[PDB]
Amino acid sequence: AVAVGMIETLGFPAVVEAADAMVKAARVTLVGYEKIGTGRVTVIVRGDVSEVQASVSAGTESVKRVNGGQVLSTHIIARPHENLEYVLPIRYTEEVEQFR
Amino acid sequence: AVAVGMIETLGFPAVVEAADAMVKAARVTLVGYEKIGTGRVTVIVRGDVSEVQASVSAGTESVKRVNGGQVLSTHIIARPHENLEYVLPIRYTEEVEQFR
Amino acid sequence: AVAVGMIETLGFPAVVEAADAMVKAARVTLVGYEKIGTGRVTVIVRGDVSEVQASVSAGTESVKRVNGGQVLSTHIIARPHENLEYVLPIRYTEEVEQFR
Amino acid sequence: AVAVGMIETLGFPAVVEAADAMVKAARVTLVGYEKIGTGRVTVIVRGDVSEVQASVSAGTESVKRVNGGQVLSTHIIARPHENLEYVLPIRYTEEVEQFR
Amino acid sequence: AVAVGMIETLGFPAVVEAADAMVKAARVTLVGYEKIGTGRVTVIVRGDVSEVQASVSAGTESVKRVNGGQVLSTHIIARPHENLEYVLPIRYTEEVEQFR
Amino acid sequence: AVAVGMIETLGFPAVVEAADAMVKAARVTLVGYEKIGTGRVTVIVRGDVSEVQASVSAGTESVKRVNGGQVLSTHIIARPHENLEYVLPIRYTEEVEQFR
Amino acid sequence: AVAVGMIETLGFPAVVEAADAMVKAARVTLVGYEKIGTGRVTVIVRGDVSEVQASVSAGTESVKRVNGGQVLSTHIIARPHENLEYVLPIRYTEEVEQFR
Amino acid sequence: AVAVGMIETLGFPAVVEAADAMVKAARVTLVGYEKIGTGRVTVIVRGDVSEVQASVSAGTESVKRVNGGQVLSTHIIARPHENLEYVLPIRYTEEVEQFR
Amino acid sequence: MQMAKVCGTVVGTQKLPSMTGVKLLLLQFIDANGELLPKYEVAADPVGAGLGEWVLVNRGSAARQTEYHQNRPLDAMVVAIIDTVTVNNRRLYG
Amino acid sequence: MQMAKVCGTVVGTQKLPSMTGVKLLLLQFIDANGELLPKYEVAADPVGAGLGEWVLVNRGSAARQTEYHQNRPLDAMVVAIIDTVTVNNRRLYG
Amino acid sequence: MQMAKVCGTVVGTQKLPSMTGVKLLLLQFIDANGELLPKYEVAADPVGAGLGEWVLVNRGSAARQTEYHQNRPLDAMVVAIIDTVTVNNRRLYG
Amino acid sequence: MQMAKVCGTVVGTQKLPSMTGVKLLLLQFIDANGELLPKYEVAADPVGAGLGEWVLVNRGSAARQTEYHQNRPLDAMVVAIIDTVTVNNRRLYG
Amino acid sequence: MQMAKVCGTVVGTQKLPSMTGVKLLLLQFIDANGELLPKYEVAADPVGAGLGEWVLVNRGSAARQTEYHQNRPLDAMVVAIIDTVTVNNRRLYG
C-alpha cells in the first residue's frame, strides 16, 4: 500500500516536533499517534516513498534540537501489506482525509 | 496559525505549577493535558509565538520551586501544521474558548 | 485451531516491520496487535504451522533492520486450544477475513 | 508462489548428491540447476515450505558423504514473488511437470 | 527514465534472497540477472528512484540472513542514459512487463 | 578511426556506473560491454578524443563513489587502427547507431 | 606458414592497447582475439617474422602506458605448421583480408 | 588556429621516436624540428588540442623505450597567437600540407 | 539576510551523502513592501518553518555556521522565522 | 560595501540560538545619486543605527569578522553609519 | 541552492590540473513556477545527472564541501537530483 | 574583478573599530565598452586612487587578502589602478 | 562557473604587490545558446587563453584555490579553456 513512516520518541514535546517537521519537510499525511507505555510515543505518517523518506530523515534531525528530546526508533516501510492497515493503527482516518 | 508550546514534567504537582505559571506570565491559553506514562505529563499552551516563548520560559523556572518534580522536555512551535490539530491533542477545545 | 505466531518487540516501529515481514514471508494472516505496557508490543499471526514458523523467524530478522528495535520474545503454538480465541486476542476478526 | 530451496555447493558431484537427497527426502521438485563460476553450482527445488525445509536440510547433510564436496550456501524462500520466476531460473519448466 | 538499481552478491542463494527482498519492499520490477564470473551475481531492478533506494537497502540487509553469501557491491542510478538499455542488460524485457 | 575509451572495473554495479557516467559527462557512444572472467568487466565508448578523454576521466572518478566498486584499468586510444574494429568488440553496432 | 605473434595480457584495456601498438609498429595483421578465463586475454598478429618480432616487442612496451595493464606472456612462432590454423584461432578470417 | 605541442628530448634517436609516436597516436601533423644546443631537440606537432594532448602524452612515454634518450620538456598550447607563427618555427610548411 | 515566503518543499532522493537529513524549502523572495518578487531560493531549514511563513534566509558561507551544517554543501539557510516587520514605525507583518 | 537607508526593523522570535541578540535592520539600498533602489537587505547592526540613517552594509563572509559575529549565520552587516558622501567634489549627503 | 535543468555538457581539455576528473554540466536555471530562466551555470556533477534532469545547484564555497572538491577551483556543484517539487501542497515536478 | 570609475568618497565617523583607517571610495561600475553602468560599490582603497581614475575592484573574501584587511569587515577593495584596457587589439583606455 | 569569451586584456601598473604577475583578461559572458551577454568580468588567467577563446571562469573564493593564487586578492579566474559545448546532444561549440 501507501508507504508508512514511524518516528518513536521518548516524550511528548519530542513527538510533536517529530510530527510537525515530518509534514513540513515533505508531502506526507500524519495519520496516527501511538503510545505504548514508558513514554515511548510514535507518530505515523503516510505518503509516497520519496516523501516519507524525506520526512522521517528530517523529522529525526529535528528531535535532536529539542531539549530532553530523544529518538528511540525510526522506520520506513515503503510498501506495507494491506493486512497491516486493518490491525495496526497506521491507516488513514476520516479526520486526515483532507491532507491525503 | 496559533503557536503551540509544551512543557513535560515528571509528576502532576509539577505540571500544574508549570501550567499555572504559563497562563499567568503571558497571553497564552492552556488547551491540553497529556499523559504518556512513567509520570511524564505534558501541558499544552496556545498563543502567539512571543507569548508562548515567555510562558514556557516562566513555566520551566516554576518547576524548580516544586520539590519532587522536574522539567523533562520543553518545546515551542511557531506555527504548527493543520495536520497536527486533528491527530495531536494541541487544538483549542470548546471549554477553553473563553480564554482565547 | 490453526497455528499462532507471536513476536513481542520493544517499540512500535519494530513491531510494524515485524508484522510486515511476517505477512510477506508466508501465507499467514496478521490478526492481532497487543500492548501490555513498558513498550512491550506483540503482533499475532495465524496460519499453518510451517507458514507461521517461516513468518515468525523472518519477522525476527527484520527487526534488526530497525534502529532502536529489539525482539523481546517470540513463540509459535502449532495447535492452540479453542478456549484461547475467546479470551486472548489471537482470533480472526471480521476485518481480517479477506486475508485468511 | 510456492517455496524455493537452494543449495550451493563447490563441485558437481556434491550438487548431484545434494539434488538426489532433496527429492528423496520430501515432496519437492528439482526444477533448476545453475552455474555461476568458480565451481559454485546451485540446485533449486520447489515445493511446500515444510517439504522444502525438510529437503534442503537433508541435502546439506548428504554432501558430507561426498569426498571433496562442500556446501557453500543454503537458503529457503517460503513465498517468493511472482517476478522471480520470470527472471531467475527457479521456475517450473515443462520437462519437470510430471514431478510437481 | 525509470531508475535502475543493482545488488551484486557472491553466490546464487544470496542473489535470490536479495531479489526477493527487493520486489517485496517497494514497487520495483526485477528485470535482469547477470553473471560476470568468480561467483559474482547481480540482480537488476527498475522502478522509481525512491522505490529503488528502498529496495536496494532492504535487499542488502536480507543477504546477511543467508549463511554463505555476502553483498559485494550495490548501486542506484536515478535515471540511466538511453544508451545503457541497448548495451547493458538493464532494460525491461517482455516477460516482465506484467510487473511494471 | 574514431577514438575508443575503455574502463575495466571489478564488478557489475561499478561498470554500469562507469558506463552511465561516461555517456553523461561527454558526447560519447557506449558501444561495448566486455566480460573476460574473474569479474573483470569492461565498457567501451566511442567518440571524439575530447569527448572520450572527458568521459573516461569522469567515469573513473564516479566508480570510486560506489561501495564495492574498483577501477582495474582505464585507457584511451585516440586513433585506433581500422584493423581493430573487425577483431576486437569496439565497433559501432546497429543498436547504438542512433547515439553516434 | 606466415608467422604468428601472440601477446597475452591481464585485462581488456591492456589488450586493445597491445593490439593497437602492434599493427601501427609493423606490417602485421591482427587476426585473432582469445579469452581463456581469469582475465587472460590474447591478441594474435600475423605477418613476416621480422615484422611480427617488431610488433610484439612494441605491443609489450605499450601495455606499460595502461594503468593496471600487465603482460602475462608473449610468444612469436616464426613458421607455424598448417595444422594450427584449422584448430587454433590464428588464421586469417575473411573480415581481416583487407589488411593482409 | 590549431593547437601546438612540443616535446623536447635529449638526443636525436629519442626525438624521432617521440615524433613517430605523436603522429601515430592522434590526428596531429608533425610540422617542425628544432635544435637549440646541448643536444636539446624539439619536435612540434599541430592539431586539435585534444589530439595534441593525446600525442604528446604518447610521445613522452615512447622515449622511455629509447636507451640513451630522455624527455626534457613538454608543453601544449591550445591556440597560439598569430604572432608566434611568423617568429617561432611552429607554422605549417609547404611540405606538410598533405598531412594536415 | 533576505525576507522570503515559504512556498513549498523540494525533495531529492539521489543526492550527496552529506545532504541527507537536510530539509529543503522552496522560498520565494518578498520585497520590503511585502509583494512577492520573481526570484526564489532552496534553503536548508533548521528552524522549523511551514508553508506560508515569512522567513529570514541567508546566503553563501553563512549557511554553514550552525555547527551541524559545517561541512555540508549549503549556500542558503533559513535562520529565523519572522515574527513582525516594522517599516517607518508601521507594522507591515505580524 | 553598499550604501543603504534604514527603513525599519525585523523581529524574529524563533531563530537559531546563534541568532540571539542580533539586531536586524531592514535596509533599502540607495544608488550613487541618493535615490532609493528597489532592492533591500536584512543586516546585523553592531553600529547602532536608527530609522532613516544612511549606512554602509557589507555582504557575505565579511559580516562574520566582528569577533562576536564569527560563528553566527550572518551574510550582511552594517559596518558604518555614513556621515558624508562627496560625489565629484560635491557633497551629496551630510 | 537553485533549481536547474541539465541542458548539456561542457568539455575543456586545457584546464588547471586540479580541474581534471570534474564532470562539468551546462545547467539552465528554472523558476519556482517551472519555466526556464534566461540564466545558466556550469557546475561540477558528483551526483550523476543526465540531460533533462532537475538538479539542485549550490553556489560559491559550498561547492568545495564534498571532501574531494576541497582544493578545486569550483564555485557551483550539483548537490541533489530533484525527485519532487511540491508547491502550495500541489506537486509541481515528479 | 570589475572595472570601476572613482566617482567620490564615503566618510563615516560612527563605525566599527576594525573599520578605522580604511579609505572608502564610491566607485561606479563601467562596462567593457567603457560606459557607466547604473551600479556602484563602496570599496577599501589600499592602492591610492583619486577621483576619475579607472580601478579594478574585487568583491567578497578576496578583499581580505592583503594582510592588513584580514579581519576587517570588507567585501570590496580596489586592487589595481587601470593603466590600459585593450579590447580586440584596440586600446580602449590609456 | 560561467562561460565567457576573451575580449581583451587589462593592464594595471599601480596595483597591490600580491597582484604582480597575475595576467588579467577582460572576459565578456556568453549565454547558454552562445550569444554575448551585456556582462563582463576581469579574471586571472593561469590557463593560457588568448583573445576570442571560450573559457570557463569561476567567481569568489574558488579563484584562490590553485595554490599560487591563495593569498592573492582575486575573485575571478579562468579555470578551463572550453574545447566543446554540447547542448541537447548537439554540438554548440568546437
PDB file of N, CA and C in Angstrom, chain L residues 1-45:
ATOM      1  N   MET L   1      37.229  40.233 -10.813  1.00  0.00           N
ATOM      2  CA  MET L   1      37.334  41.680 -10.683  1.00  0.00           C
ATOM      3  C   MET L   1      36.382  42.397 -11.621  1.00  0.00           C
ATOM      4  N   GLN L   2      36.063  43.636 -11.276  1.00  0.00           N
ATOM      5  CA  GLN L   2      35.254  44.508 -12.108  1.00  0.00           C
ATOM      6  C   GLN L   2      35.996  45.815 -12.324  1.00  0.00           C
ATOM      7  N   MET L   3      35.802  46.404 -13.497  1.00  0.00           N
ATOM      8  CA  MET L   3      36.318  47.734 -13.771  1.00  0.00           C
ATOM      9  C   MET L   3      35.331  48.770 -13.260  1.00  0.00           C
ATOM     10  N   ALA L   4      35.844  49.752 -12.530  1.00  0.00           N
ATOM     11  CA  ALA L   4      35.009  50.789 -11.955  1.00  0.00           C
ATOM     12  C   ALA L   4      35.711  52.129 -12.081  1.00  0.00           C
ATOM     13  N   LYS L   5      34.918  53.189 -12.020  1.00  0.00           N
ATOM     14  CA  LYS L   5      35.409  54.556 -12.054  1.00  0.00           C
ATOM     15  C   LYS L   5      35.182  55.201 -10.695  1.00  0.00           C
ATOM     16  N   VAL L   6      36.204  55.885 -10.185  1.00  0.00           N
ATOM     17  CA  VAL L   6      36.116  56.559  -8.892  1.00  0.00           C
ATOM     18  C   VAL L   6      35.214  57.776  -9.070  1.00  0.00           C
ATOM     19  N   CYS L   7      34.047  57.752  -8.426  1.00  0.00           N
ATOM     20  CA  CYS L   7      33.126  58.876  -8.532  1.00  0.00           C
ATOM     21  C   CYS L   7      33.084  59.701  -7.253  1.00  0.00           C
ATOM     22  N   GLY L   8      33.643  59.193  -6.165  1.00  0.00           N
ATOM     23  CA  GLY L   8      33.718  60.005  -4.977  1.00  0.00           C
ATOM     24  C   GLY L   8      34.184  59.235  -3.765  1.00  0.00           C
ATOM     25  N   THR L   9      33.965  59.843  -2.600  1.00  0.00           N
ATOM     26  CA  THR L   9      34.408  59.302  -1.325  1.00  0.00           C
ATOM     27  C   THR L   9      33.226  59.197  -0.378  1.00  0.00           C
ATOM     28  N   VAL L  10      33.259  58.185   0.482  1.00  0.00           N
ATOM     29  CA  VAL L  10      32.275  57.999   1.540  1.00  0.00           C
ATOM     30  C   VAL L  10      33.007  58.076   2.869  1.00  0.00           C
ATOM     31  N   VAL L  11      32.565  58.975   3.740  1.00  0.00           N
ATOM     32  CA  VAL L  11      33.162  59.154   5.056  1.00  0.00           C
ATOM     33  C   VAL L  11      32.116  58.791   6.097  1.00  0.00           C
ATOM     34  N   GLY L  12      32.456  57.851   6.969  1.00  0.00           N
ATOM     35  CA  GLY L  12      31.626  57.542   8.111  1.00  0.00           C
ATOM     36  C   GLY L  12      32.434  57.610   9.385  1.00  0.00           C
ATOM     37  N   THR L  13      31.962  58.367  10.369  1.00  0.00           N
ATOM     38  CA  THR L  13      32.697  58.503  11.619  1.00  0.00           C
ATOM     39  C   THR L  13      32.236  57.518  12.683  1.00  0.00           C
ATOM     40  N   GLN L  14      30.950  57.187  12.710  1.00  0.00           N
ATOM     41  CA  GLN L  14      30.410  56.182  13.615  1.00  0.00           C
ATOM     42  C   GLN L  14      30.455  54.839  12.894  1.00  0.00           C
ATOM     43  N   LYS L  15      31.434  54.012  13.242  1.00  0.00           N
ATOM     44  CA  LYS L  15      31.680  52.772  12.520  1.00  0.00           C
ATOM     45  C   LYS L  15      32.220  51.734  13.492  1.00  0.00           C
ATOM     46  N   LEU L  16      32.567  50.573  12.950  1.00  0.00           N
ATOM     47  CA  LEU L  16      33.224  49.546  13.734  1.00  0.00           C
ATOM     48  C   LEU L  16      34.668  49.953  14.018  1.00  0.00           C
ATOM     49  N   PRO L  17      35.239  49.496  15.139  1.00  0.00           N
ATOM     50  CA  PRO L  17      36.649  49.818  15.423  1.00  0.00           C
ATOM     51  C   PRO L  17      37.628  49.193  14.446  1.00  0.00           C
ATOM     52  N   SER L  18      37.250  48.092  13.797  1.00  0.00           N
ATOM     53  CA  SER L  18      38.116  47.489  12.793  1.00  0.00           C
ATOM     54  C   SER L  18      37.974  48.165  11.436  1.00  0.00           C
ATOM     55  N   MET L  19      37.031  49.097  11.299  1.00  0.00           N
ATOM     56  CA  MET L  19      36.872  49.832  10.051  1.00  0.00           C
ATOM     57  C   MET L  19      37.636  51.148  10.037  1.00  0.00           C
ATOM     58  N   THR L  20      38.437  51.435  11.058  1.00  0.00           N
ATOM     59  CA  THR L  20      39.150  52.704  11.095  1.00  0.00           C
ATOM     60  C   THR L  20      40.426  52.620  10.263  1.00  0.00           C
ATOM     61  N   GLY L  21      40.835  53.760   9.714  1.00  0.00           N
ATOM     62  CA  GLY L  21      41.955  53.810   8.801  1.00  0.00           C
ATOM     63  C   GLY L  21      41.661  53.341   7.392  1.00  0.00           C
ATOM     64  N   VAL L  22      40.452  52.859   7.124  1.00  0.00           N
ATOM     65  CA  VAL L  22      40.070  52.336   5.820  1.00  0.00           C
ATOM     66  C   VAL L  22      39.521  53.484   4.989  1.00  0.00           C
ATOM     67  N   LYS L  23      40.148  53.737   3.846  1.00  0.00           N
ATOM     68  CA  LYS L  23      39.687  54.766   2.925  1.00  0.00           C
ATOM     69  C   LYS L  23      38.607  54.182   2.024  1.00  0.00           C
ATOM     70  N   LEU L  24      37.433  54.802   2.022  1.00  0.00           N
ATOM     71  CA  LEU L  24      36.266  54.285   1.323  1.00  0.00           C
ATOM     72  C   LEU L  24      35.967  55.138   0.101  1.00  0.00           C
ATOM     73  N   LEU L  25      36.036  54.525  -1.070  1.00  0.00           N
ATOM     74  CA  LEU L  25      35.758  55.193  -2.329  1.00  0.00           C
ATOM     75  C   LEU L  25      34.410  54.751  -2.875  1.00  0.00           C
ATOM     76  N   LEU L  26      33.653  55.718  -3.377  1.00  0.00           N
ATOM     77  CA  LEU L  26      32.417  55.451  -4.099  1.00  0.00           C
ATOM     78  C   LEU L  26      32.788  55.210  -5.556  1.00  0.00           C
ATOM     79  N   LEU L  27      32.589  53.983  -6.016  1.00  0.00           N
ATOM     80  CA  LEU L  27      33.048  53.541  -7.323  1.00  0.00           C
ATOM     81  C   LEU L  27      31.846  53.159  -8.165  1.00  0.00           C
ATOM     82  N   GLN L  28      31.720  53.751  -9.344  1.00  0.00           N
ATOM     83  CA  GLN L  28      30.668  53.370 -10.274  1.00  0.00           C
ATOM     84  C   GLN L  28      31.228  52.389 -11.290  1.00  0.00           C
ATOM     85  N   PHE L  29      30.527  51.279 -11.484  1.00  0.00           N
ATOM     86  CA  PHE L  29      30.991  50.259 -12.409  1.00  0.00           C
ATOM     87  C   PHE L  29      30.810  50.711 -13.851  1.00  0.00           C
ATOM     88  N   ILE L  30      31.825  50.451 -14.660  1.00  0.00           N
ATOM     89  CA  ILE L  30      31.823  50.742 -16.084  1.00  0.00           C
ATOM     90  C   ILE L  30      31.799  49.422 -16.834  1.00  0.00           C
ATOM     91  N   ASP L  31      31.252  49.432 -18.046  1.00  0.00           N
ATOM     92  CA  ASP L  31      31.147  48.189 -18.796  1.00  0.00           C
ATOM     93  C   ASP L  31      32.436  47.925 -19.575  1.00  0.00           C
ATOM     94  N   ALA L  32      32.429  46.848 -20.365  1.00  0.00           N
ATOM     95  CA  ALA L  32      33.590  46.523 -21.186  1.00  0.00           C
ATOM     96  C   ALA L  32      33.757  47.501 -22.340  1.00  0.00           C
ATOM     97  N   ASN L  33      32.675  48.165 -22.751  1.00  0.00           N
ATOM     98  CA  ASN L  33      32.767  49.145 -23.826  1.00  0.00           C
ATOM     99  C   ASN L  33      33.186  50.514 -23.304  1.00  0.00           C
ATOM    100  N   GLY L  34      33.086  50.738 -21.996  1.00  0.00           N
ATOM    101  CA  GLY L  34      33.576  51.952 -21.378  1.00  0.00           C
ATOM    102  C   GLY L  34      32.536  52.891 -20.798  1.00  0.00           C
ATOM    103  N   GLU L  35      31.246  52.603 -20.951  1.00  0.00           N
ATOM    104  CA  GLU L  35      30.203  53.482 -20.443  1.00  0.00           C
ATOM    105  C   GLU L  35      29.866  53.136 -19.001  1.00  0.00           C
ATOM    106  N   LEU L  36      29.313  54.113 -18.290  1.00  0.00           N
ATOM    107  CA  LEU L  36      28.989  53.936 -16.882  1.00  0.00           C
ATOM    108  C   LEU L  36      27.720  53.107 -16.733  1.00  0.00           C
ATOM    109  N   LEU L  37      27.799  52.049 -15.941  1.00  0.00           N
ATOM    110  CA  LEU L  37      26.636  51.243 -15.620  1.00  0.00           C
ATOM    111  C   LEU L  37      25.894  51.848 -14.430  1.00  0.00           C
ATOM    112  N   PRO L  38      24.571  51.648 -14.337  1.00  0.00           N
ATOM    113  CA  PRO L  38      23.831  52.092 -13.139  1.00  0.00           C
ATOM    114  C   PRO L  38      23.993  51.131 -11.963  1.00  0.00           C
ATOM    115  N   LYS L  39      25.232  50.970 -11.513  1.00  0.00           N
ATOM    116  CA  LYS L  39      25.584  50.075 -10.423  1.00  0.00           C
ATOM    117  C   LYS L  39      26.859  50.604  -9.794  1.00  0.00           C
ATOM    118  N   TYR L  40      26.918  50.589  -8.471  1.00  0.00           N
ATOM    119  CA  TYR L  40      28.029  51.175  -7.747  1.00  0.00           C
ATOM    120  C   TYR L  40      28.552  50.208  -6.696  1.00  0.00           C
ATOM    121  N   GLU L  41      29.588  50.656  -5.997  1.00  0.00           N
ATOM    122  CA  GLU L  41      30.187  49.924  -4.897  1.00  0.00           C
ATOM    123  C   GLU L  41      30.914  50.918  -4.007  1.00  0.00           C
ATOM    124  N   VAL L  42      31.078  50.555  -2.742  1.00  0.00           N
ATOM    125  CA  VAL L  42      31.976  51.254  -1.835  1.00  0.00           C
ATOM    126  C   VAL L  42      33.075  50.273  -1.464  1.00  0.00           C
ATOM    127  N   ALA L  43      34.319  50.631  -1.760  1.00  0.00           N
ATOM    128  CA  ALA L  43      35.431  49.712  -1.593  1.00  0.00           C
ATOM    129  C   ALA L  43      36.543  50.353  -0.785  1.00  0.00           C
ATOM    130  N   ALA L  44      37.303  49.504  -0.101  1.00  0.00           N
ATOM    131  CA  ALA L  44      38.555  49.924   0.503  1.00  0.00           C
ATOM    132  C   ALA L  44      39.580  50.218  -0.583  1.00  0.00           C
ATOM    133  N   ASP L  45      40.468  51.170  -0.303  1.00  0.00           N
ATOM    134  CA  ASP L  45      41.427  51.664  -1.287  1.00  0.00           C
ATOM    135  C   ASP L  45      42.841  51.594  -0.720  1.00  0.00           C
TER     136      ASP L  45
END
